[PDB]
Amino acid sequence: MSEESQAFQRQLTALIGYDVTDVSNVHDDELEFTRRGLVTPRMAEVASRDPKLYAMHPWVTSKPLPEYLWKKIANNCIFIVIHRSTTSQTIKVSPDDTPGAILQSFFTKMAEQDFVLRVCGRDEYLVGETPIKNFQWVRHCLKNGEEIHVVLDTPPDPALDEVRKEECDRKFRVKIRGIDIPVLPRNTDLTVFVEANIQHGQQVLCQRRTSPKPFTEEVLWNVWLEFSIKIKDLPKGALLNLQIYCLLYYVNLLLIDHRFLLRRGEYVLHMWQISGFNADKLTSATNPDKENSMSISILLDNHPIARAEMPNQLRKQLEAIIATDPLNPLTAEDKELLWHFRYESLKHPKAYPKLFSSVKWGQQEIVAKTYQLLARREVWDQSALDVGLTMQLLDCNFSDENVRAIAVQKLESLEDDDVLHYLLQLVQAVKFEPYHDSALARFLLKRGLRNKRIGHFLFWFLRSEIAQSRHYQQRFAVILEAYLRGCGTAMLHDFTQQVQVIEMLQKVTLDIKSLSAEKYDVSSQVISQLKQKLENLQNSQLPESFRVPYDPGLKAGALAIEKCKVMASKKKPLWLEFKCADPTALSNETIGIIFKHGDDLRQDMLILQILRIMESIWETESLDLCLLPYGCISTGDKIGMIEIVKDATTIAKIQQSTVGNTGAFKDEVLNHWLKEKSPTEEKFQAAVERFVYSCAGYCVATFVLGIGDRHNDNIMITETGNLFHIDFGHERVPFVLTPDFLFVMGTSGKKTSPHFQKFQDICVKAYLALRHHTNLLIILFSMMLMTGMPQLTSKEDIEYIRDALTVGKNEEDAKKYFLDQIEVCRDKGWTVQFNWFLHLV
Template identity: 40%
Template sequence: MDSISDPELLDFLPQLVQALKYECYLDSSLVRFLLRRAIGDIRIAHYLFWLLKDNLQDSQFSARYQHLLAALLCCVGRGLREEFDRQCWLVSVLTKVAHKVRDTALSSRQCVLREGLEEMKQFFSVNSSCRLPLNPALLVSGINIQSCSFFNSNAVPLKLSFQNLDPLGDHINVIFKSGDDLRQDMLTLQVIRVMNKIWIQEGLDMRMVIFKCFSTGRGRGMVEMIPQADTLRKIQVEHGVTGSFKDRPLADWLQKHNPTDEQYDKAVENFIYSCAGCCVATYILGICDRHNDNIMLKTSGHMFHIDFGKFLGHAQMFGNIKRDRAPFVFTSDMAYVINGGDKPSSRFHDFVDLCCEAYNLIRKHTHLFLNLLGLMLSCGIPELSDLEDLKYVYDALRPHESEADATMYFTRLIESSLGSVATKLNFFIHNLAQMKFTSSEDRPTLSFAPRVHTAKSDGLIRNLYICRHIRTVNKGYVFVVKVERDGQQEALLVQRTFEEFHELHSKLRLMFPSSKLPSFPSRFVIGRSRGEATADRRKDELNGYVWHLIHAAPDVAQCDLVYTFFYPLPRDERPGTTSSKPTDTWSPPSGRALGEVKLSISYKSDKLFIMVMHIRGLQPLQDGTDPDPYVKLYLLPDPQKTSKRKTKAARRTCNPTYNEMLVTRIPRGDLDQRVIHLRVLGDGAFWENTVLGETFIPLKRLVPGQHWVDWHQLGAAGSDSAH
């Protein structure tokens, strides 16, 4: 163990502290090893102190940990002993404040919090600085009381803003919890951090957000706050309380914070990787209680989970019904971001491949994760108490299966999670439950506007006029509004859709009585709602609406919501575009190609294994609808058609994912003479199937024992390109 580096030792320090229980003697080689490394690195000394202090609550081994803690304090010297005393004092003050705030009525909590934090000023008048227990690298010199608040969850955690000792550094924001056992959160984040390191070592960066969380005693601790991030609930309710049932909220929010194409594409890439990592990690660890306040999204596109109070499959129950019904959280609004629209695209193939690759990499280290969790069985975490809890992880990792079987298994999990209505219903119920906590001071914001604008900062609007409408790439219409302001020589042109006008009106109704607002044009039309005649009529109706809006009472006409709506966005500089992204990033090759199919082919023990992975770029049917494609293949020559194999049919897509294994027996000597004849057909009614494309793949290129993974071009039936 002497060869292990300090960062690696920190990764496994909680397990080593638990292992001290199994030493025969107090003076053991493990004890000497930990003390020696603590003397050499302040981070190890810091975390070892708090881990030993936390284990003093263990009645069976309390005496042993007291002796070890005394030995550590003796070894580290006077300076660190005084530092640990300051940290304990800080935690004691914060615990007292947290209890007062939690026991106070909701309306008085902010006042009680500010009064309680006055004691922190006394603390910092005596101590010029203090390291936070969360991370010894965080040195604070004071607290910003006006910036502190609390969260409206059951334990009422405190949101604290400390002054950085470094005058050039940002304020340090942390969450202090009292009443929640953070040891389970610590363990979950530790395991996810180890998973992430395995992925990176294998050359797979899943863009995971790993934040710090540390227990400072039973029922209390600190959690790092990630900047520039919002919960999915906050993002979804920008589209109303039913926002969790809609597909666009996440994409619109990312578009709002990443206005250029380059920024948005980078954010989507970060989202694809981090979402895949979250799906794998939360499934393996059986993380439950996944409502939309426990999942967060950064403006950079990184998704991450928080609050791990339920894991290893210990789901919350509604009577006899599990609240978490899906294998993991993967909803249609997440798929919308990945696909760039509501139809599957080639980017979804990348997402599935990432999930399966990440899952298989972790499966190779099954024993490591079972040992990490097994060493924590004696620490007293309620949901990690016996071998059944370890068996949950073993069953999730399926170490006895091949990589191909595991890939097929996880693909089915993705399909099951995406098709689960229970997850969205869970989000919606949580939205309703949180409405009672919504502050009356919270002002509505527009889902597509990155910041708030005011009449004072941007100048009074003199006149508004919708001068024309433009047809967009998705066959809708955007309305061009001419905005004239005081102090501006030239009028500005902004582009807004009818749905965005409707969002403005809906949120104005939350702020003002209907009697103060002009009536809004009906959203419902008879006939084609996207026709030019409808757009002309709506232009006239919207002109009447904005005229009455700008001539309404000043508190309405000059409110921040109106001025934010008519403030130019980056997209307004590109005529004829809207906030929507292209629905697909892949275009089929020129010529007679009808798409491509991705196969993984291998040969072992007289068996040919053909995994049909993905197809991209299929052509729509003659009526313009997407087909229901499936794959059928033969091994030629095969006059009796005994080698026929086929996949299930995917529904309404030109870019299906299958990850299905088709197996057939073939003697080794016949391999070079056989050819795979693969056809993609559209599943039709009454056995009338349409041939969407085909290809012939000679097996003479296949090396037995190796996997041949490649895309193969599809051509028309009987064409040269198919051959």
């Protein structure tokens, strides 16, 4: 290698937070073979990307402008405001105009074309052949009552993005030699055995057990477990899953390796413990903690895989199976039906997930017939893209690489607008891949190299997982390293700045927790220590400026130390505020960020992103629900950052006004609060209208996800009427519609009014509109639980969103379901709100 060629790698190791060159925790060479594998997909994407459009990364959509934004143009004329140091003219522009064309109506409208329209305040450009209607920044301004302010400066140089030069019919059998752990102690002595499973996509093909033996710190069986499955009948992606019961430990081993070879030889595998189903259970990884883990010891000593029309009455039996939801379990009779009529099931793309479940993967001849099936893929290829259907095929139920590859194909037709909607969940879906190198891993590599925005979020998603998941940190680390070797030095410099900042502040965050009592109030001495510490960073430590991880447009600047504080409450988070580092910004307002150790922010990332998916769904049906799904990025273990929505107060603090007698509650307070923060009555009626959409928006979304039983403390509202929930980390009421919310709507329990008629309307409008995407939400929710929670019931927890999206029902019945739910919040009123307080003391 070279001298500075190793300084590059230690730069990579610091942005990843993991050493990919390490081999202390591998029993073969898959990860290093996957570093080499991905060089090609990287150099292909890097080489065929437009340098100019990659530097400016225009954020752009092909979808139609919604109905609720075409009304904000009653005139077919939109207002842009081009700038230059001081002076700045206003240019009249029809929505169908184009970046090039609105420089033609500027220079010619005065009485050389190597200038560019950058946005005031941000690293966001309006460029490339697209209508201004079809730029996201523009749509964001039209949606807010804001006006499009734009500065005119020289394009960023592609030079700064330059990437550096790179560099048998025998049955299967396994001897369980024995297990071994340095120290086990609990209290009483029990017995112990080892269970061995040939597993393919959460489907046991075959299972044998050892005799039991007394659980000493070394148990030796020296026993062959002879299976029934033949070596030829083993499918690629099958896992030998070794588990210990007395269920205390587990570990997996791909029986067929990344090079198609059958697995052979001696293996001492270090095992994962079970904390007192999920995606950690499927991992080919081994416990890196060698000094404290249990270890199994085994031996393989066993290469491979080298007309007629239906009676109308069965067809209806088959169609009814195909109509059902992704969780409705398939009977043996259902599966045999799907499979006997493979070719008719193949005419329906929605049948695919259920059809490839009906395959017996533990038979060689039937897999080979399945590959014959996939070969004539004329209807699947021609069909319209279904994201939920595609996602279904990338979940834990499918480990066949070609089943999974036909799904990733469908994804390649997604534009960047849609990739960013599902990026986090596609990254979590890499946990379900049997092999480190996979079509999905390379799809993400490709899409983040092609677009800096996707590239940026791909970084923080991968880095989130690497930092807090031993089960998948090695794999993701190899994926991330591939990305950082191709994103170009402009972005590598950007990431280095961000990683430096957030490691400075998480230092300050955890150092502040300790000094303050476990819980009581805030020391005067602690507010002194926070100021001193941030004045000691501000000077000779902190970057002049850093990109805001959750909003990569905004470049934060120096700290506004006067407005920074420790937060009086839940695990001493840092309320930090920053100056904006761009001097063409049209505002003196600060970038607010909270830094919190304590809560599992991965869970918030996940709920917030589903919230953004529900916003885009409502886009397809001309509905806006005013949701404020703010930025939140997990950066490590029970730690991360959060976006501070400006001018927002907690609904509980609005009721603490005076006294707040450990739980006094009063109906009319919210409405009076909304009129104080309104200078006019005109802006107050604009706030109530905002509260009707926002309250309705979080009401529906929260019922669907089953996170609607919440304290007033975890629900906020802006000075301008926009309600929103916060903090999604882990008698009943389906959602929060307290009597105070209804008094804004002009209704005090068991009555109706014009504003409440609007709310009821908007709710069912939103509830029916989400049900048109039932399969999407069921499958995202199911995946959310598997990759983003503790241990869960792979039937029972998911079954909520079935009953909540009232599956199998007609539209009328559904409207009734949700309207009953409103009348449960109006029957109980303050009962459940009051109930928080009572438990405590």
